[PDB]
Amino acid sequence: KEVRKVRIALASPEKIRSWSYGEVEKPETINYRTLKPERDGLFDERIFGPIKDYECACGKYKRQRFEGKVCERCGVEVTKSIVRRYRMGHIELATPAAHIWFVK
Amino acid sequence: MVQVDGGRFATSDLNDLYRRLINRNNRLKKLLAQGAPEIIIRNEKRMLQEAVDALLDNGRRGAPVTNPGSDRPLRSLTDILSGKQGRFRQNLLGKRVDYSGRSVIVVGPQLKLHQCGLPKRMALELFKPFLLKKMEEKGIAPNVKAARRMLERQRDIKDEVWDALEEVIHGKVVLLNRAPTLHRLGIQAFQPVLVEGQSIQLHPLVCEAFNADFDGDQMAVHVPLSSFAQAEARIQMLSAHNLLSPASGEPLAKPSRDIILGL
Amino acid sequence: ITIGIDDAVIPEEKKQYLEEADRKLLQIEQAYEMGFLTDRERYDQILQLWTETTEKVTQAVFKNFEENYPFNPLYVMAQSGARGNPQQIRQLCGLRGLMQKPSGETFEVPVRSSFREGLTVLEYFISSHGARKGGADTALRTADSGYLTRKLVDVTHE
Amino acid sequence: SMARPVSIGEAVGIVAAQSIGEPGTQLTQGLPRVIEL
Amino acid sequence: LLMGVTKSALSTKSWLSAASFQNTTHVLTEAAIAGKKDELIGLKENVILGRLIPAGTGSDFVRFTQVVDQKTLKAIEEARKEA
Amino acid sequence: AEPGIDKLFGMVDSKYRLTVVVAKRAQQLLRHGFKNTVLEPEERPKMQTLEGLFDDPNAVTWAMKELLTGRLVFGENLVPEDRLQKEMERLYPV
Amino acid sequence: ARTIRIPVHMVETINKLSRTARQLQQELGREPTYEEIAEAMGPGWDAKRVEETLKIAQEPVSLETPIGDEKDSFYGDFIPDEHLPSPVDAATQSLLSEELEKALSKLSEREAMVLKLRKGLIDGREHTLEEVGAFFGVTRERIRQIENKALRKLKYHESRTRKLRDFLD
Amino acid sequence: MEIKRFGRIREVIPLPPLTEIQVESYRRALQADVPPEKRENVGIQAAFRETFPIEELVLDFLEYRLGEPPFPQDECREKDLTYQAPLYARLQLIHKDTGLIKEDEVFLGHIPLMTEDGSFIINGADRVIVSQIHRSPGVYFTPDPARPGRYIASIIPLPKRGPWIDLEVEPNGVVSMKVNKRKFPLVLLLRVLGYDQETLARELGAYGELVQGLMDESVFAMRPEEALIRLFTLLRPGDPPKRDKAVAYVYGLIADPRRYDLGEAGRYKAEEKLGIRLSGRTLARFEDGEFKDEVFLPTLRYLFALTAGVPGHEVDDIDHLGNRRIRTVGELMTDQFRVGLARLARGVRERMLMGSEDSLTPAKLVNSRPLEAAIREFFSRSQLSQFKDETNPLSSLRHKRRISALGPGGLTRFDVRDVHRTHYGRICPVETPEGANIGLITSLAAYARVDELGFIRTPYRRVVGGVVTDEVVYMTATEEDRYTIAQANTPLEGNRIAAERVVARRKGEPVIVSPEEVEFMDVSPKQVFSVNTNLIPFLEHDDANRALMGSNMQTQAVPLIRAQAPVVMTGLEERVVRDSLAALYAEEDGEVAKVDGNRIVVRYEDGRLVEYPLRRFYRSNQGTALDQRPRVVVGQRVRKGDLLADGPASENGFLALGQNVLVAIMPFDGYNFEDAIVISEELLKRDFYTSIHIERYEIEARDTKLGPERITRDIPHLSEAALRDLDEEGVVRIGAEVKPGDILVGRTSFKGESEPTPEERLLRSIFGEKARDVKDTSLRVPPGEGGIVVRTVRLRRGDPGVELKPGVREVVRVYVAQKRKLQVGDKLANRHGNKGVVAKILPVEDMPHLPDGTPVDVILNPLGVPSRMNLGQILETHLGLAGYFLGQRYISPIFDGAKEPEIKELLAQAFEVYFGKRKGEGFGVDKREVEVLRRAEKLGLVTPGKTPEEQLKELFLQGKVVLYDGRTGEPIEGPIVVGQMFIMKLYHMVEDKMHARSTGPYSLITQQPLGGKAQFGGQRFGEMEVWALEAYGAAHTLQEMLTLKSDDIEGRNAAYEAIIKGEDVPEPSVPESFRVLVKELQALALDVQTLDEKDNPVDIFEGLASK
RNA sequence: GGGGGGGG
DNA sequence: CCTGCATCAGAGCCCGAAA
Ligand SMILES: [Mg+2]
Ligand SMILES: [Zn+2]
């Protein structure tokens, strides 16, 4: 069906989690020698998606006959790497934190 | 975080604003498990707020967080959305486009009002997809992939290419724009007449609408692709169909300078 | 149609109108240095004097053109609307006129030269304050206009 | 622009804006007054 | 009520319009609270979406107009008139 | 100017309707290879190449000239849009 | 401290290179080359290892850096996206599979199906000897043979349909 | 040819050395040429002497030295190094506790050296540091805007060396003092410095209501120590007011001659205004254990007397050039130097506490890094260090003489943009940028010198009673307003004042006075204008707005291979090239030994044999060819200061930014329209307006984690035709014609895990080629560029003398040259601000031509003149006409130049050659000259009833000519102005600017076309362009721009597929950057969703983000 | 806590 | 009740922009 409206509304912590594919646990980015993304860091493929299309991280499942499988060894979905543009993560706060827009 | 030409790395500011958040959350988690005094837990809890507040809207409250050894505020999500360089005004209400080009402007007294002179080397590129298709329907290349290979090197362009182009752009218009586009005739459609040389030829009568001099002005070219876009241009945006001002109702295309002088 | 220096014709009427101006101008300073009328009153009445003198020479420039040189290039281009307006032409043939101090208030002494005649260095420096003030003004304006327009589009686009 | 009655679907609002704004550069109370109004 | 153009603009229904104008966080804050739905009535909204603007060739007045040649037009009409 | 544009604005209540008809029709012919054209071999818009006259490839040129003849009909809710598609592909294949 | 976090002892080595160099420069009255650092570091250190230590120490730069001017220029705006295919590339890859299968079916699709099962249009089904023991239609060394005959029938089939040369780049 | 000089004005003094604002400033800052005792306490010396001694043990500073540069100038340019000297400092460590003293010479790093012409080389590129104008420090009194009868005194120090302070007297009646946006009763401070109620009343009493308004009893209930703590609580709440730390805060704030610095100039101006003498450059002292006032009461005293209308008390005009000074190169750099010194001192005191308080030397105590980085940052990234403008030699000379009011310490986002009456003779009123920056950036006037305190002064002649001395006194704006200063042109017999009424100024106001009344006289007219402005003949006849463009475009003239000086000069074009240093001159008298294309060797009287090598075909920052040409022949005898080689855009040592061309001034069938220009193909034929341009191309081979990049001749899949002009190792051979797509440098890179797709390996399986593992990464020629390879530079890892940034093996550079003939699109201009793009090139047979057959070079439209009011170009060509037939060039000084009767005199002499020859060799008047003459007589141009010869002379004296249209042979119905004009070819060439793009690179995040020709960018269709399509109602054109033609990835790939297959483009999909907006709003915890008619959600991600 | 060398 | 009075978010377009 066709787009006719655009709604905007608050997001519950519940719903933020409904978006999320993984909690980002580490401030790491990419490993300094593999330059591949560190797992549970800010670029982890296990959360956000494969870097290369229809190919897992360690290389066990490498093309499209598997679409949607999650590699046992490395844990990455086999889809189009375009997903790294869409898949949200999330950070579980210890203490709650106010959203400054609604404060100031 | 991308490797740019150099093997160097280049990274968006949000990553450093997230890292500051993650450290503080993580360390608060540990100070809790280790039962630290509340003056310590209080201090981190407040720093956590400020990490969240610089991520969401750095600078909004208190000192803006900066990269070490730089005075540059990190650009936070609010910064991205907002302002002249923000998402809305820089990439949603207006983008850069394909099938466009720019050159210096030159008067073309011999043009008819619906025309302009368009450099053929420009026209080659702006219409290049079309040119490839024509190139194979005749025969100057076996298929579209060889056709493109041929126009890569300037030495390997042979004269019958240009006759192929002329066929392509037949009847089609291009758009001309001179910034600042103050009103709707900052853009107007012209049937292009290919020219040697590198300069666009503008028709004398349209210079007023455009506020176009020839003291080095330049003008952008745009090629409407679909049948729909081309029909809009030819009917609604053709120079010849817009002779009157939409503001006063008076003639906009009119004699001026030499044309008056001679008459 | 061409333009050579001789095509910017100083009217004979010009010298007479200038002598008329100085004899009335010394009328005004005796009324000052004898204390009949103010220094504000005197600055005011010489400004209107030189304004009227400027107008006088402008129509002088065009009457001499129309009657004696009706096909002069400057006359033709201005008259037909091809290019130039009276006070531009007035500056080539008559006098440059009153300039303005940085503050905006005008100088009492005008530029008596024309561009054909050529300005004195002091006339040229005097006239520069106005040019520069105009150039800055226009530069701040286009931003104010640009913003205005975006507001308008924003309020009417639907 | 057409010396004739307006076609259903013309983006008048935009046109109106462009019409008022374009002379903008050349206003020497001048343009401030207009903003004030 | 008389407001000038800036405040008038920022007060339209369309939050995609106002947020893209100015005062973006304020505009977005209040809208998100209200659960505002943009009906995409004006042109900026549809520009932001890359949709086809509701003017010109995009007006619902002229958009659905059909064109048929007479040869097709009654070639079709004959097969559909009978049972 | 577009040949006969003053007449083409005579045709419509609203200028944007003219160009909708024109653009629609222009893709009608490009899809059907022009074979559904209303015009006859001497009305066909021609284009001069180096070899000689050939058909004008530009279907927007075509549609406006077609339109001027008056053999096209235009309007809203003429016919269910799906039912056109195949009877046109039936009469003039691709 | 580093956007690319690096092990704690490796940073300890990097910090040492800098202290080493700074004293070097402090006595030499000019910037040392990697060799003068390498020996000042003792055994195990050559100049290539000074050099690869510094490339590791390199910190990333901000996509939001202003390109001088500071008005209207970001570094990131100068950086092309080389991941997503361009319209030509996506068209070239489509074009290839289009005439790739319109060339297998033109001998027969069966022996082109055996070969197509060998490499894989979408899957990459490439091992070597064994699995072929199962379902192609025949036993095991025959698939390798009809591999060649499909390949060389392809190669004559292509000397006529020589439109694939261009894909060689 | 003969040159004729006009002008009655005898100039007592030549122009000063015009780069002296740069050279003298840095030389004074470094003092490298002075023995360290003898150094005065300025610049580098002053920074050291203010940073040291460093207290705890004490590190003290002995002297500094500067070594010689590790590499010479051109050597630095070649290898992308900075031209700089090693800086060493000898310091003695002294232990306060024991008595140990170890002293060593510590290396502080390198300081960049300035070249002879007053520029720098920073990583291989020339740069210029532009002087900054700002408010002089001192004490100022301005009127209170809100309260009319009141005034604010302000004390303002050097930038970043103290706070600014206001002394508003609030409605309350007390004297209030503003600091750091904080207000408080100033009398609070008064007590702190040891005042009490008697001293305030005895000194100040005269002001009935005002002096008693400062008195507040609760504050005196308190000795000076109490009041010290008083205030500290005011200004940093929460900090415990320890008597120790309140002292330190306010001391460092107010009296610390290290954290607070008024100028050396600020010190004098304060002494002069308040009528005091200052012990140092701080507002107060700490002496004998308590605070001692310096400034505050003279400042308070001055304000109260002005309040009351006491005589001798005046407001200060803050725009007056006596209260505004310039921060030259030296000052600017030493400011950055002192900052880096003070940073290094933070590291010294830190290390004077850790690590063994005895086992330490100066060497291990100092870390150079914070000084090195401070200087490197001032030079590479400061916004006053500019990429040199060396388009032509004048470009760089104007650059050095520029004055910016932006910068760290000037304006930014009318009063300061205005021409102030004190600019006269100091800052050019004409040369300034059109646009947003107008009046913020300006140029040093020609005779102006910047003095020790940084005020601009201008020369003036003293006049005694009535006779004009030859003594010249350079004068700041403040001292100028005391005197009556006569105009430069006022008439004089010998040295006596010859008019009984003289035109003079007094405080910039113009006044008529007698010769008894005059105290000084202007040196020259040139002293009021910049160098560029001074290069405009007949400037007295040009409206200023167009003279403004005449100035600035001379900066932009590109060096022509046939460059020639203008037929009408002003007399400054000789020393411009001399001070430019483009041309090369003779040191002493002597005899030329040898003359080569590459070299010229001269033997002087000294016996020495000096060899001058010549820079030939060197590429400037802007790509224009800097090239010196030998102008003397072997054996020629030469004096001191004679010229030996012409620089670029110089002809026989005169500045040559264009060519003299024969111009007719008439419309021409529409190709003249709205400033376009019509030129004759004759100019291309004889290589007029042809210029050489070199672009530089670079490429690096790097070590990658996939393996090495190698600069190869072996490139997968490419024919020998593609590689013919490549040498053995894969770089193009010197002297090859390279055109777009050609390869200049071969290079292979290892293919990423893009490991040929199964689709690809099968493909190459069939051809029996196995896919190589290296990719073609060669450096090719970009679209629209090209030329002939003239040079290659190859720098590898492991060669002697070379090691590159970490990771890169080898870097190759290829210099490509082009000879660019003039073409339609390219920009011409004259010195009067007439500018136009050449729109048409007619063949010689279409050009209007004179009756004796010679055709004009360029046709300019007259419509360009009346509204622009730049009549100087009109006189320029008249005199050009005379000179064309007489074979002369002329020197008409500005404002003292050739006047109409004088030009007619030489025009008459010219007519005899144009016409007397004609009748001589057997030809009479032409039938067509009679038809023109007929209509000219109807225009009142010729007197009726004279022979055709008599009447053509009358037209020739008006500058007009009989012209025959080459197309018809029939005459132009009127007599037309024709003459020689100086017209430059500006740097804006269409070859540089044409650009077009079908598809190309896209931005990382937004997936929208990149920008800019160099990126194969796409044009920006912005906000106002959408409005344009919106008004037109071009909904489908507009939607195309918003999708297919930008970031609608599916629709853009699909559209491209449709066109190369001949179908119409598919209706678009969702722009990727709206998808980006959604996810950024989710990143702000905002749930934005697309719905349908029935309000059911619509998934814009085609299921790809839902689980 | 908001801003700049060139072209139109 | 109203006014000072404070806190915030605005400040033209496109292209070279010489990092
Ligand atoms: Mg212009
Ligand atoms: Zn895996």
UniProtKB/Swiss-Prot annotation, chain C:
Domain of life from the UniProt record: Bacteria
Taxonomic source organism: Thermus thermophilus (strain ATCC 27634 / DSM 579 / HB8)
Role noted for this protein: DNA-dependent RNA polymerase catalyzes the transcription of DNA into RNA using the four ribonucleoside triphosphates as substrates.
Disulfides per UniProt: none
Subunit structure as annotated in this protein's UniProt entry: The RNAP catalytic core consists of 2 alpha, 1 beta, 1 beta' and 1 omega subunit. When a sigma factor is associated with the core the holoenzyme is formed, which can initiate transcription.
Species classification: Bacteria, Thermotogati, Deinococcota, Deinococci, Thermales
Protein name: DNA-directed RNA polymerase subunit beta'
Family: Belongs to the RNA polymerase beta' chain family.
Portion of the full sequence shown: 947 to 1104 of 1524
Swiss-Prot record, chain F:
Recorded catalytic activity of this chain's protein: RNA(n) + a ribonucleoside 5'-triphosphate = RNA(n+1) + diphosphate
Domain of life where this protein originates: Bacteria
Keywords: DNA-directed RNA polymerase, Nucleotidyltransferase, Transcription, Transferase
GO MF annotation, one: DNA binding
GO term, biological process aspect, one: DNA-templated transcription
GO cellular component: DNA-directed RNA polymerase complex
Gene3D superfamilies: 3.90.940.10
Enzyme Commission (EC) number: 2.7.7.6
NCBIfam families: rpoZ
Protein role: Promotes RNA polymerase assembly. Latches the N- and C-terminal regions of the beta' subunit thereby facilitating its interaction with the beta and alpha subunits.
Subunit comment: The RNAP catalytic core consists of 2 alpha, 1 beta, 1 beta' and 1 omega subunit. When a sigma factor is associated with the core the holoenzyme is formed, which can initiate transcription.
Family per record: Belongs to the RNA polymerase subunit omega family.
Protein known as: DNA-directed RNA polymerase subunit omega
Organism of origin: Thermus thermophilus (strain ATCC 27634 / DSM 579 / HB8)
Swiss-Prot record, chain H:
Domain of life: Bacteria
Catalysed reaction equations from the record: RNA(n) + a ribonucleoside 5'-triphosphate = RNA(n+1) + diphosphate
One example GO MF annotation: DNA binding
Signal peptide positions on this chain: none
Pfam family, one: RNA_pol_Rpb2_45
Entries under InterPro entries matching the protein: DNA-dir_RNA_pol_bsu_ext_1_sf, DNA-dir_RNA_pol_bsu_external_1, DNA-dir_RNA_pol_su2, DNA-dir_RNAP_su2_dom, DNA-dir_RNAP_su2_hyb_sf, RNA_pol_bsu_bac, RNA_pol_bsu_CS, RNA_pol_bsu_protrusion
GO biological process, one term: DNA-templated transcription
Record's subunit section: The RNAP catalytic core consists of 2 alpha, 1 beta, 1 beta' and 1 omega subunit. When a sigma factor is associated with the core the holoenzyme is formed, which can initiate transcription.
NCBIfam families with a match to the protein in the record: PRK00405.1, rpoB
Protein's name according to its UniProt entry: DNA-directed RNA polymerase subunit beta
Gene this protein is translated from: rpoB
